[PDB]
Amino acid sequence: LIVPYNLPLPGGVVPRMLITILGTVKPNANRIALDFQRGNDVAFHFNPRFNENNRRVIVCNTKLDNNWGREERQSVFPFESGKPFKIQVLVEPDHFKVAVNDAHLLQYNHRVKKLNEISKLGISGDIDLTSASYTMI
Numbered sequence: 001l002i003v004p005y006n007l008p009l010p011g012g013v014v015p016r017m018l019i020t021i022l023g024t025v026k027p028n029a030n031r032i033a034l035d036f037q038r039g040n041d042v043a044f045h046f047n048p049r050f051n052e053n054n055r056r057v058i059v060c061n062t063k064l065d066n067n068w069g070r071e072e073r074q075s076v077f078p079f080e081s082g083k084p085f086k087i088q089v090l091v092e093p094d095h096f097k098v099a100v101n102d103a104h105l106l107q108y109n110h111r112v113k114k115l116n117e118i119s120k121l122g123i124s125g126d127i128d129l130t131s132a133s134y135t136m137i
């Protein structure tokens with residue numbers, strides 16, 4: 001698929017919804033972003049950074065009224081330049097749970113409460129996107 005890519009989430013998200021993003025990281029990747037949006041608000045921004053002060057970090061945040069909130073950062077970094085990945089975002093009642101390549105990575109508590117209005121997933125950055133889909137577990 002072509003990046004950037006928008007995946008509609010009609011009627012938003014619900015607990016037990018498993019969103020699977022498959023792709024390959026580009027060989028000289030700098031950044032990747034998943035943006036779960038409620039209109040212009042970003043309920044959940046998931047942002048692997050490959051070279052922030054010569055380190056790799058996962059930055060997560062929410063954007064409300066076009067303002068970024070308090071970042072939640074994780075140094076566990078499962079992505080590798082040039083390699084195929086699977087990001088799974090499992091919607092739970094109180095958080096998003098992220099697993100990469102079938103290993104738990106992080107949880108992000110719901111700041112945006114209206115899950116049934118989080119109706120788009122934006123996928124951007126330094127990937128070849130293979131597929132973006134969801135199922136109910």
Ligand SMILES: CO[C@@H]1[C@@H](n2cc(-c3cc(F)c(F)c(F)c3)nn2)[C@@H](O)[C@@H](CO)O[C@H]1C(=O)N(c1cc(Cl)cc(Cl)c1)[C@H]1CC[C@@H]1O
Nearest residue numbers: 031032033045047059060061062068069070071124125126
């Ligand atoms: C560059 O801005 C990022 C935010 N971001 C990333 C992308 C993005 C990522 C992709 F992978 C991608 F492919 C793409 F197309 C677009 N779009 N927006 C977004 O990642 C946001 C997450 O908090 O961080 C922003 C940030 O870099 N800072 C920022 C942070 C806070 Cl809280 C407040 C403020 Cl005003 C700026 C830093 C300056 C000093 C701050 O530490």
